[PDB]
Amino acid sequence: ANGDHAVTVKDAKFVVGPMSSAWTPFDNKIVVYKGDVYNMDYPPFGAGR
Amino acid sequence: TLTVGFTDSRKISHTCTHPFHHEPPVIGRERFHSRPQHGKELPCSTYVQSTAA
Amino acid sequence: NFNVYKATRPYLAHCPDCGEGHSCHSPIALERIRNEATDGTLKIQVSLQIGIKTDDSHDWTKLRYMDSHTPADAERAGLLVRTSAPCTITGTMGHFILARCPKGETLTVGFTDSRKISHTCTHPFHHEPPVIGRERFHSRPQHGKELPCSTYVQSTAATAEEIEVHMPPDTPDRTLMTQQSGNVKITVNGQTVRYKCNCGGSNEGLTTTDKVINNCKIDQCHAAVTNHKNWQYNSPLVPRNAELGDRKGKIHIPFPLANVTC
Amino acid sequence: EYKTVIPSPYVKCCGTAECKDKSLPDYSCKVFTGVYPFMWGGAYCFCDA
Amino acid sequence: PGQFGDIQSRTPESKDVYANTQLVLQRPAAGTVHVPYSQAPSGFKYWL
Amino acid sequence: EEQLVESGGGLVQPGGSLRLSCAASGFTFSSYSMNWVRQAPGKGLEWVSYISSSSSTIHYADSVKGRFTISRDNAKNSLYLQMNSLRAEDTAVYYCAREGNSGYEPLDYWGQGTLVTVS
Amino acid sequence: RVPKARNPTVTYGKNQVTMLLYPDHPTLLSYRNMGQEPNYHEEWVTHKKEVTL
Amino acid sequence: KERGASLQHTAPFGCQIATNPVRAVNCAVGNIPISIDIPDAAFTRVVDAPSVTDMSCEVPACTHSSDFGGVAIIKYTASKKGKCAVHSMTNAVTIREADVEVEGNSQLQISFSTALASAEFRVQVCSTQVHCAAACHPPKDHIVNYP
Amino acid sequence: DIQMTQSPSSLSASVGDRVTITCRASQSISSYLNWYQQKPGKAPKLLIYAASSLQSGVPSRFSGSGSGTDFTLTISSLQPEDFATYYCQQSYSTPWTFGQGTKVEI
């Protein structure tokens, strides 16, 4: 979904994109565990409790 | 609680008792007591019956 | 009377939890559990038959169970029921057992085989007796009042509820086949055996003697035992023999309801 | 109270089953495809499909 | 389907029975033989 | 070489009994099934009895039921046929034979029987 | 292996849905709105209950 | 024991989450431009296509529900056998059928949906236009399972 | 159970002639049929064990084939050693049965 790629099928050329919106459901810090994704502000390395 | 014991060679028993708190976790969105016939499969972990090094 | 059982045989059934957390095929299995009486008694149905020997005689100390292609005897003393705490068994006949036992979330039954091997099968259940009166109590008082309630009667007499029996289907058994030097041998061991092969020649037949099929491999053929002389209850856990089944007979359900006081 | 009655199932492998309507209360009938049953002694029918 | 009056009859000795329960058959599990179904629980016990 | 040796014939009075033995050499006895057959002057071929290799399956002809019993010993390499309640009409030569370990139910070997007379 | 719950009874009205639940054991119920504001809600159900949304 | 609900149940706009690799799918935001390059060989000259000279329209039924609840009948006379495309000239009415076949003197039937309580629109068939109008009734079903 | 008959009851032919013997059955045998040959005064007997098959040690002059309840055996050359009694046997069911026998004389 950008303007730097094209495909041809049956001598027809297609170009798709770019998208009009930059909204993304993910934050900068995520935690992943066996299929689940959480948004969590984890502590820095070396500064636990 | 948890208790173990055995029988001696002279027909005498021995026991020892320690405190413990045992409560298995829940897998999925429902709480159940036994294994059904009709259902779904989810990942989990177990111990393997192997004596290898 | 036990005369109605003369032509019947036990059967095997699937069990969802065979004691280790895995299923297996067991000589003992559970059918529906009934809890209609207001006094908190249960009626349980199983696949084995209590009180009858393999020679169709009456002996209240023996039970008979199904082994591989043949019935066998076992001792009654090994029968147990529990739902958390042990249950108390109050009476038995044929496929049915009565027992009383405390609250719990599971029900387990089992017995001991003739070779010193145990078998169990577990199903989920929810047991909670009703409340009678305006007070909740745990045991039987000495000084008190009487109120109506219902119970089960310890009677083996004929009643109006009946169940049906049918002819068993054929049973596959892969151990009848062996491969030697590029050929497959079929051993009948005195039974009537039907076979099918996908090897050259399209071999089909029904035999009462040993046969050898040349130039054929194992797992290209199928065999089953087809000739039966006894009748079996049409449990939902076994396949129908034919699209339209034929009826051979029926047996009655013991232990009716009656009115009592509490 | 009510009671539910269920007879033994009929399985026809490498052939097509069908059924007809009946006047009994709450009668229901359905056919499923793609079955491969097992019993204690091995697979029941020769056909795999 | 789940209240008082789900099963009705005129007298204890009648043969004519009316019922409005739900009953749906489900696909069997792989490798086994059984008849699963879904049915609404009896309303009479709930009243008691 | 393969051999079948029959012995035990003779004359027995009516009401008596006689045991026949068939001895084998040259092959593995426990791997093959065996049959007994009968022939007499003026008569054709007739099958008498069959025993499977493990002594699990036994069949008798309808005319010989009860009076005849068959057994084998796979450790002694011997085959037996015993006749009881002998009757005067039972005068014939009895033979043992091997059944082949291949398809289409062949019979590869025959013995040389002995005369049994009841009189 | 885990079990599945039985089907509810559902009726309709103007801008609303009514559901009657038949639990056998503790079961979790949750719902959300589609679009920008999910308005997430969560509850546990332990016995026969009727809800409207 | 206390981690709570994950993004799969709380995210807005109906997004769904996968983890191997981490992905988000079917998020209903924005729009997407497209450009297509069609070769000259796909086009047919107007002098070769069939012509239609006389048309009329009638509308026997309309219900302005979420589904295709409208039907129309159009009569035509065609000069010769061939194929023809159809297109609507309004935004409030959408037509399911993309192409029709015309021959001789006959009639064709199309289906449409609209939210208007009173409908008026024009339909184009091989470079000519017809005017249609009708009155529509409300539906009776409160809730449906589709947009 | 399965009855068998063979024809002719006897053949009369000179050295150098061909021999044809047929066997019939009252029931389907599905090719489970064999042939036997022996001379008077001897117990052993043996010919081909199956239709269109040659038994080990049997001269090539002996051949035959099988079909639904209709079996045939022929000899391409008749020599003084070839004059004997012939039988058919079926091994499809239980009990096993034999034919009545055919003899060939000079």
PDB file of N, CA and C in Angstrom, chain B residues 1-37:
ATOM      1  N   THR B   1      -2.359 -28.588  53.010  1.00  0.00           N
ATOM      2  CA  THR B   1      -1.319 -29.362  53.670  1.00  0.00           C
ATOM      3  C   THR B   1      -0.786 -30.402  52.693  1.00  0.00           C
ATOM      4  N   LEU B   2       0.388 -30.956  53.000  1.00  0.00           N
ATOM      5  CA  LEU B   2       0.917 -32.085  52.242  1.00  0.00           C
ATOM      6  C   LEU B   2       1.623 -33.061  53.170  1.00  0.00           C
ATOM      7  N   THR B   3       1.277 -34.345  53.052  1.00  0.00           N
ATOM      8  CA  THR B   3       1.818 -35.404  53.895  1.00  0.00           C
ATOM      9  C   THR B   3       2.342 -36.544  53.031  1.00  0.00           C
ATOM     10  N   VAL B   4       3.472 -37.130  53.438  1.00  0.00           N
ATOM     11  CA  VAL B   4       4.018 -38.325  52.807  1.00  0.00           C
ATOM     12  C   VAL B   4       4.350 -39.343  53.892  1.00  0.00           C
ATOM     13  N   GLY B   5       4.438 -40.610  53.490  1.00  0.00           N
ATOM     14  CA  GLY B   5       4.861 -41.642  54.421  1.00  0.00           C
ATOM     15  C   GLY B   5       5.079 -42.975  53.741  1.00  0.00           C
ATOM     16  N   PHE B   6       5.582 -43.926  54.531  1.00  0.00           N
ATOM     17  CA  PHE B   6       5.909 -45.265  54.054  1.00  0.00           C
ATOM     18  C   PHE B   6       5.853 -46.227  55.235  1.00  0.00           C
ATOM     19  N   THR B   7       5.915 -47.523  54.935  1.00  0.00           N
ATOM     20  CA  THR B   7       5.940 -48.566  55.954  1.00  0.00           C
ATOM     21  C   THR B   7       7.322 -49.200  56.068  1.00  0.00           C
ATOM     22  N   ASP B   8       7.767 -49.394  57.308  1.00  0.00           N
ATOM     23  CA  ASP B   8       9.083 -49.936  57.619  1.00  0.00           C
ATOM     24  C   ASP B   8       9.095 -51.456  57.460  1.00  0.00           C
ATOM     25  N   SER B   9      10.264 -52.054  57.700  1.00  0.00           N
ATOM     26  CA  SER B   9      10.436 -53.499  57.611  1.00  0.00           C
ATOM     27  C   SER B   9       9.938 -54.234  58.849  1.00  0.00           C
ATOM     28  N   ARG B  10       9.621 -53.516  59.929  1.00  0.00           N
ATOM     29  CA  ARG B  10       9.167 -54.112  61.179  1.00  0.00           C
ATOM     30  C   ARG B  10       7.703 -53.796  61.466  1.00  0.00           C
ATOM     31  N   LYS B  11       6.921 -53.501  60.422  1.00  0.00           N
ATOM     32  CA  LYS B  11       5.492 -53.182  60.536  1.00  0.00           C
ATOM     33  C   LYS B  11       5.255 -51.907  61.347  1.00  0.00           C
ATOM     34  N   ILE B  12       6.076 -50.887  61.103  1.00  0.00           N
ATOM     35  CA  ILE B  12       5.940 -49.582  61.740  1.00  0.00           C
ATOM     36  C   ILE B  12       5.802 -48.523  60.654  1.00  0.00           C
ATOM     37  N   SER B  13       4.876 -47.587  60.853  1.00  0.00           N
ATOM     38  CA  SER B  13       4.631 -46.512  59.901  1.00  0.00           C
ATOM     39  C   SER B  13       5.369 -45.239  60.305  1.00  0.00           C
ATOM     40  N   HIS B  14       5.674 -44.409  59.306  1.00  0.00           N
ATOM     41  CA  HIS B  14       6.308 -43.113  59.510  1.00  0.00           C
ATOM     42  C   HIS B  14       5.646 -42.065  58.627  1.00  0.00           C
ATOM     43  N   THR B  15       5.433 -40.865  59.173  1.00  0.00           N
ATOM     44  CA  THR B  15       4.868 -39.756  58.411  1.00  0.00           C
ATOM     45  C   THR B  15       5.634 -38.472  58.709  1.00  0.00           C
ATOM     46  N   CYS B  16       5.482 -37.492  57.815  1.00  0.00           N
ATOM     47  CA  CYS B  16       5.981 -36.138  58.028  1.00  0.00           C
ATOM     48  C   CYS B  16       5.069 -35.161  57.295  1.00  0.00           C
ATOM     49  N   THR B  17       4.725 -34.058  57.960  1.00  0.00           N
ATOM     50  CA  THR B  17       3.763 -33.089  57.449  1.00  0.00           C
ATOM     51  C   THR B  17       4.385 -31.702  57.318  1.00  0.00           C
ATOM     52  N   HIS B  18       4.103 -31.031  56.200  1.00  0.00           N
ATOM     53  CA  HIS B  18       4.483 -29.642  55.981  1.00  0.00           C
ATOM     54  C   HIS B  18       3.301 -28.822  55.485  1.00  0.00           C
ATOM     55  N   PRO B  19       3.277 -27.524  55.792  1.00  0.00           N
ATOM     56  CA  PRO B  19       2.269 -26.637  55.198  1.00  0.00           C
ATOM     57  C   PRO B  19       2.534 -26.361  53.723  1.00  0.00           C
ATOM     58  N   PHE B  20       1.454 -26.086  52.992  1.00  0.00           N
ATOM     59  CA  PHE B  20       1.539 -25.760  51.573  1.00  0.00           C
ATOM     60  C   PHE B  20       0.243 -25.080  51.152  1.00  0.00           C
ATOM     61  N   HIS B  21       0.299 -24.362  50.031  1.00  0.00           N
ATOM     62  CA  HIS B  21      -0.887 -23.771  49.414  1.00  0.00           C
ATOM     63  C   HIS B  21      -0.941 -24.194  47.951  1.00  0.00           C
ATOM     64  N   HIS B  22      -1.907 -25.044  47.609  1.00  0.00           N
ATOM     65  CA  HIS B  22      -2.035 -25.597  46.266  1.00  0.00           C
ATOM     66  C   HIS B  22      -3.336 -25.121  45.637  1.00  0.00           C
ATOM     67  N   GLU B  23      -3.227 -24.462  44.484  1.00  0.00           N
ATOM     68  CA  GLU B  23      -4.374 -23.959  43.738  1.00  0.00           C
ATOM     69  C   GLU B  23      -4.010 -23.825  42.264  1.00  0.00           C
ATOM     70  N   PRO B  24      -4.491 -24.718  41.404  1.00  0.00           N
ATOM     71  CA  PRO B  24      -4.111 -24.669  39.987  1.00  0.00           C
ATOM     72  C   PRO B  24      -4.621 -23.403  39.322  1.00  0.00           C
ATOM     73  N   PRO B  25      -3.969 -22.959  38.252  1.00  0.00           N
ATOM     74  CA  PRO B  25      -4.446 -21.785  37.515  1.00  0.00           C
ATOM     75  C   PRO B  25      -5.629 -22.127  36.620  1.00  0.00           C
ATOM     76  N   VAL B  26      -6.235 -21.077  36.072  1.00  0.00           N
ATOM     77  CA  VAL B  26      -7.360 -21.198  35.151  1.00  0.00           C
ATOM     78  C   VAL B  26      -6.868 -20.934  33.733  1.00  0.00           C
ATOM     79  N   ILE B  27      -7.302 -21.772  32.794  1.00  0.00           N
ATOM     80  CA  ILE B  27      -7.000 -21.608  31.379  1.00  0.00           C
ATOM     81  C   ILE B  27      -8.306 -21.336  30.650  1.00  0.00           C
ATOM     82  N   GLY B  28      -8.348 -20.240  29.904  1.00  0.00           N
ATOM     83  CA  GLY B  28      -9.550 -19.863  29.197  1.00  0.00           C
ATOM     84  C   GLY B  28     -10.410 -18.909  29.999  1.00  0.00           C
ATOM     85  N   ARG B  29     -11.628 -18.714  29.499  1.00  0.00           N
ATOM     86  CA  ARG B  29     -12.573 -17.772  30.079  1.00  0.00           C
ATOM     87  C   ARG B  29     -13.652 -18.459  30.910  1.00  0.00           C
ATOM     88  N   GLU B  30     -13.496 -19.751  31.191  1.00  0.00           N
ATOM     89  CA  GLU B  30     -14.470 -20.513  31.958  1.00  0.00           C
ATOM     90  C   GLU B  30     -13.750 -21.378  32.983  1.00  0.00           C
ATOM     91  N   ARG B  31     -14.403 -21.581  34.123  1.00  0.00           N
ATOM     92  CA  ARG B  31     -13.887 -22.432  35.186  1.00  0.00           C
ATOM     93  C   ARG B  31     -14.624 -23.763  35.158  1.00  0.00           C
ATOM     94  N   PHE B  32     -13.870 -24.861  35.168  1.00  0.00           N
ATOM     95  CA  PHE B  32     -14.449 -26.187  35.017  1.00  0.00           C
ATOM     96  C   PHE B  32     -13.696 -27.175  35.896  1.00  0.00           C
ATOM     97  N   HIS B  33     -14.331 -28.325  36.136  1.00  0.00           N
ATOM     98  CA  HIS B  33     -13.820 -29.308  37.080  1.00  0.00           C
ATOM     99  C   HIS B  33     -13.322 -30.598  36.443  1.00  0.00           C
ATOM    100  N   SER B  34     -13.733 -30.914  35.218  1.00  0.00           N
ATOM    101  CA  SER B  34     -13.373 -32.189  34.611  1.00  0.00           C
ATOM    102  C   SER B  34     -13.205 -32.010  33.107  1.00  0.00           C
ATOM    103  N   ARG B  35     -12.798 -33.093  32.446  1.00  0.00           N
ATOM    104  CA  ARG B  35     -12.458 -33.064  31.030  1.00  0.00           C
ATOM    105  C   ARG B  35     -13.687 -33.374  30.185  1.00  0.00           C
ATOM    106  N   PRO B  36     -14.129 -32.467  29.320  1.00  0.00           N
ATOM    107  CA  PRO B  36     -15.320 -32.722  28.504  1.00  0.00           C
ATOM    108  C   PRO B  36     -14.986 -33.562  27.276  1.00  0.00           C
ATOM    109  N   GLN B  37     -16.042 -34.004  26.591  1.00  0.00           N
ATOM    110  CA  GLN B  37     -15.889 -34.644  25.288  1.00  0.00           C
ATOM    111  C   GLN B  37     -15.941 -33.654  24.130  1.00  0.00           C
TER     112      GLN B  37
END
